[PDB]
UniProtKB/Swiss-Prot annotation, chains A, D:
Binding partners and assembly: Homodimer. Interacts with the catalytically active form of TMPRSS2. Interacts with SLC6A19; this interaction is essential for expression and function of SLC6A19 in intestine. Interacts with ITGA5:ITGB1. Interacts (via PDZ-binding motif) with NHERF1 (via PDZ domains); the interaction may enhance ACE2 membrane residence.
Function: Essential counter-regulatory carboxypeptidase of the renin-angiotensin hormone system that is a critical regulator of blood volume, systemic vascular resistance, and thus cardiovascular homeostasis. Converts angiotensin I to angiotensin 1-9, a nine-amino acid peptide with anti-hypertrophic effects in cardiomyocytes, and angiotensin II to angiotensin 1-7, which then acts as a beneficial vasodilator and anti-proliferation agent, counterbalancing the actions of the vasoconstrictor angiotensin II.
Chain spans, region Essential for cleavage by TMPRSS11D and TMPRSS2: 96-115
Location of this chain's protein in the cell: Cell membrane; Cytoplasm; Cell projection, Cilium; Apical cell membrane
Domain notes: The extracellular region of the ACE2 enzyme is composed of two domains. The first is a zinc metallopeptidase domain (residues 19-611). The second domain is located at the C-terminus (residues 612-740) and is 48% identical to human collectrin.
Lineage of origin: Eukaryota, Metazoa, Chordata, Craniata, Vertebrata
Protein name per its UniProtKB record: Angiotensin-converting enzyme 2
UniProt organism field: Homo sapiens (Human)
Residues carrying covalently attached carbohydrate according to the record: N89
Tissue-specific expression: Expressed in endothelial cells from small and large arteries, and in arterial smooth muscle cells (at protein level). Expressed in enterocytes of the small intestine, Leydig cells and Sertoli cells (at protein level). Expressed in the renal proximal tubule and the small intestine (at protein level). Expressed in heart, kidney, testis, and gastrointestinal system (at protein level). In lung, expressed at low levels in some alveolar type 2 cells, the expression seems to be individual-specific (at protein level). Expressed in nasal epithelial cells (at protein level).
From Swiss-Prot, chain B:
Subunit details: Interacts in a tissue-specific manner with ACE2 in small intestine and with CLTRN in the kidney. Interacts with CLTRN; this interaction is required for trafficking of SLC6A19 to the plasma membrane and for its catalytic activation in kidneys. Interacts with ACE2; this interaction is required for trafficking of SLC6A19 to the plasma membrane and for its catalytic activation in intestine. Interacts with ANPEP; the interaction positively regulates its amino acid transporter activity.
Name this polypeptide is given: Sodium-dependent neutral amino acid transporter B(0)AT1
Residues of the full protein shown: 345 to 416 of 634
Topology Extracellular: residue spans: 1-69
Residues modified by glycosylation: N10, N24
Associated disorder: Hartnup disorder: Autosomal recessive abnormality of renal and gastrointestinal neutral amino acid transport noted for its clinical variability. First described in 1956, HND is characterized by increases in the urinary and intestinal excretion of neutral amino acids. Individuals with typical Hartnup aminoaciduria may be asymptomatic, some develop a photosensitive pellagra-like rash, attacks of cerebellar ataxia and other neurological or psychiatric features. Hyperglycinuria: A condition characterized by excess of glycine in the urine. In some cases it is associated with renal colic and renal oxalate stones.
Expressing tissues: Robust expression in kidney and small intestine, with minimal expression in pancreas. Also expressed in stomach, liver, duodenum, ileocecum, colon and prostate. Not detected in testis, whole brain, cerebellum, fetal liver, spleen, skeletal muscle, uterus, heart or lung.
Organism: Homo sapiens
Location in or out of the cell: Cell membrane; Apical cell membrane
Result of changing E61K: In HND; abolishes amino acid transport activity
């Protein structure tokens, strides 16, 4: 066996999604400050995105709140990991593959609430794919 | 629409007059504050402007509502 | 004599082209930037560009003023 | 005295703000449906707007949630009255003159979350004022 422990593994770490936000590149000037109120709006936007995915794909009505979005490892460069649990069941972590499908549906809506566009708000495992350029 | 709470695309041009009387038969004393217009063509085609206004207050107003305004 | 003043008015509207919001497309603000100019709101903005920003017209033929430089 | 009662007066009626939303004029086609999840995002956007006003004007940290925004009289044309209370004090209605100053600060931010622009999202007592047109 292995004697010792590593201080990097976490019980919520394999279901986390890292978010990286670059405010002064999408706006530069006229760029707002990222205080704790902006983190409230992000947690309500993810909770909005989980509510729409469970209604339009799985036909369930699950009332996700902003307290079900658990944010860890907040850094200055605007970086955190998050994971979504059931509304009143802390043991029930939503798997990462269904949170990725929920954000992929509503990524155009989360981007507009913060005036970012798909490169200053990146989710590190979720990449934009669609769009064929058939002009003429 | 701002007085009787109806959907958006509700009550277009094809259904103006029949939806006038559906509201006043639904609830009276809410139609009495409504101000409607009696606007109709052959009254908008029939202004008697002449001499300088056909180029400076009539023709140049219709240019601003076209696609490429500073070229026409 | 007077047909060279109509061409004087025509080339005034030609100089005020070459800008995408045309000057006869919207009302100006007055002093406090809260409301429009009063006679631009009761009349039309195009009807306001002719009588006040081109001609600066008076209320009678008896009342006359200065030479109005731009027109000159 | 007056014998009888009128069914229009309400104890929360003089502090309410009526919101009127016209979705098919700001978008037309590509216009989303207004279900109960969109009303959740509106209540979290107003709660975001009250959090920023009490921090940047009055220097207080008051944790408004989406349950403090009380929505009444929901109609099809997308119309409702709302009023904001204290976070855990239902008797403490925020006065209407301070909710009007909170929305006036963040009206550009609430508009971007729903892709509306100041005429399809009107607050009926709050009018846009600013902007001098000094081009040349
Ligand atoms: C909270 O969620 C967990 C799952 O994350 C639920 O646990 C399940 O419970 C049932 C029966 O109790 C078991 O058959 C499952 O195997 C459990 N799941 C797992 C992953 O072990 C739990 O029941 C939920 N709590 C409530 C109150 O619904
Ligand atoms: C909830 O808010 C109300 C005000 O809306 C508070 O009531 C005040 O209470 C103090 C002392 O208890 C009185 O001096 C004030 O006159 C009351 N205000 C009004 C408008 O009557 C109440 O205390 C708050 N509750 C809590 C737990 O803070
Ligand atoms: C207008 O509203 C009525 C009432 O339900 C509805 O039957 C009708 O289809 C609506 N019109 C349009 C164009 O949606
Ligand atoms: C509703 O108002 C119109 C406009 O005057 C009127 O002609 C009509 O008769 C009214 N409806 C009823 C039921 O009186
Ligand atoms: C309009 O401007 C005048 C000065 O020109 C000022 O005295 C007045 O207070 C302003 N009105 C408003 C409503 O700001
Ligand atoms: C003409 O314009 C000037 C400013 O350009 C103004 O002072 C004057 O009052 C105007 N004439 C009339 C009759 O209003």
């Amino acid at each position: 066996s292995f004697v010792g422990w590593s201080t990097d593994w976490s019980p919520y770490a394999d279901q986390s999604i890292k978010v990286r936000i670059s405010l002064k590149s999408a706006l530069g000037d006229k760029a707002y400050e990222w205080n704790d109120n902006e983190m409230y709006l992000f947690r309500s936007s993810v909770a909005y995105a989980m509510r729409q995915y469970f209604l339009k794909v799985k036909n369930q009505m699950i009332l996700f709140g902003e307290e079900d979005v658990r944010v860890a490892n907040l850094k200055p460069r605007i970086s955190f990991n998050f994971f979504v649990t059931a509304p009143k069941n802390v043991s029930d972590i939503i798997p990462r593959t269904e949170v990725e499908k929920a954000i992929r549906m509503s990524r155009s809506r989360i981007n507009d609430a913060f005036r970012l566009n798909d490169n200053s708000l990146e989710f590190l495992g979720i990449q934009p794919t669609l769009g064929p350029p058939n002009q003429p | 629409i701002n007085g009787f709470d109806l959907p958006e695309g509700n009550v277009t041009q094809e259904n103006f007059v029949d939806m006038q009387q559906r509201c006043n038969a639904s609830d009276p004393a809410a139609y009495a504050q409504l101000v409607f217009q009696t606007c109709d063509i052959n009254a908008f085609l029939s202004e008697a402007v002449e001499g300088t206004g056909l180029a400076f207050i009539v023709f140049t107003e219709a240019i601003t509502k076209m696609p490429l305004s500073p070229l026409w | 004599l007077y047909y060279n003043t109509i061409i004087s008015w025509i080339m005034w509207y030609l100089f005020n082209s070459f800008q995408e919001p045309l000057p006869w497309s919207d009302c100006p603000l007055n002093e406090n930037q809260t409301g429009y100019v009063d006679e631009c709101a009761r009349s039309s903005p195009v009807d306001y560009f002719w009588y006040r920003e081109t001609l600066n017209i008076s209320t009678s033929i008896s009342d006359s003023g200065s030479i109005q430089w731009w027109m000159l």
